[model samples]
Target: GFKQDIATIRGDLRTYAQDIFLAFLNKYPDERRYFKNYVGKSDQELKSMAKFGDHTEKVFNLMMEVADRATDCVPLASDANTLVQMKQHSSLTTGNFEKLFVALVEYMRASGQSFDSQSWDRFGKNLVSALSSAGMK
Candidate 1:
């Protein structure tokens, strides 16, 4: 009776930024290098880095902002630009939003947080598809 909508995925991670980022990174080691920092750090060492939270928090924000417009798949301009910074990362860049999408769902599940999954998935999928088409790849 308490499940909310998909907006939580974005707003959801303000607190869970580090946790979810760590989870996603561990799931895909290459992404660590693809992005930057926190790439080769040990478990404990990862926890000690600020840039880790910087990247983590931004991703969650990206998700939330995109999901805010439930019916619209077009990503916010600000977010599109943020994704640009990621794409322009000169060191082996690979921005795979689909994996990020899966990890997001897994994060919500892992944390025992409930929300509108169907819409979230739609929003996630739409963002990835549209963004990729817009050259997020």
Candidate 2:
């Protein structure tokens, strides 16, 4: 089951990530400043950004890996807490975390896929709690 879901979406992850990225920027244009390295860049240029596009696939892959391991329940909150602070958005307020969750939900719905709202809700709560516990205020 897990493998099927991964295989089913493997080829689409890149394009899906691109769509999410654009939607996220549209909803939070100010956030673009954090991605200054990708500004005014072509698609390939954007993908070349060391701290941005280059790691998109890695992030999604990590998501899948974590989800696959979390068969009983998701504890990304703890896992996220253990990961290094995100360098890309370290300078921004934690409010962006909620915005990111919304962006992803929007992308999933817009892509004509079944939105797993419950799982995402849990994910959002976990992340927000993790962020709060990390002294993000």
Candidate 3:
């Protein structure tokens, strides 16, 4: 059901991701410091570059995978720690991830995707469970 719900908006995932990224950057400017050195670009500048879309796609694709399987009551990935292990920056904070989650839900709602509170809660809870199991704490 979750995947079906997402199916209605699969084409919008990339745009949703871009919206989520921009919202995250605007709302939490300080988090920009984490990517500044590695990218050699300001947060605003990156938004206009392919770097932004690339990063957004990676994150969005992972979220889509998690959502797809969560609806089937499946655990994410071969290992629970896969997500955390995929982290490239030691500077990434839990708050950053939290903000992104919020941005994701917000974007979904704004995009007029169909989802009841129950389904939304299940999706969110599933993601939290996956992350926690992955040693994200």
Candidate 3 lDDT: 0.62
User: What CA RMSD would you report for each candidate?
Assistant: 3.8, 3.6, 3.6
TM-score of each: 0.70, 0.69, 0.70
- Ten consecutive residues with minimal summed lDDT in candidate 3? 71-80
**Structure candidate 3, residue pairs in collision:** none
Give the clashing residue pairs of candidate 2, or none. none
Model 1 per-residue lDDT tens digits across residues 1-137: 11244344445464577776677777877777665566668756876777766666876665555556434445565555556455353332224666766776676666666655455556667666666555555
By TM-score rank, best first, the candidates go 3, 1, 2
When sorted by lDDT, best at the front, the candidate numbers are 2, 3, 1
Give the C-alpha miss distance for residue 41 in model 1, angstroms: 2.2
Once fitted onto the true fold, the runs of candidate 2 whose alpha carbons sit more than 4 angstroms away are 1-11, 40-53, 69-73, 83-89
In model 2, which range of ten residues has the least summed lDDT? Answer: 1-10
Error of 3 at 113 (Å): 4.6
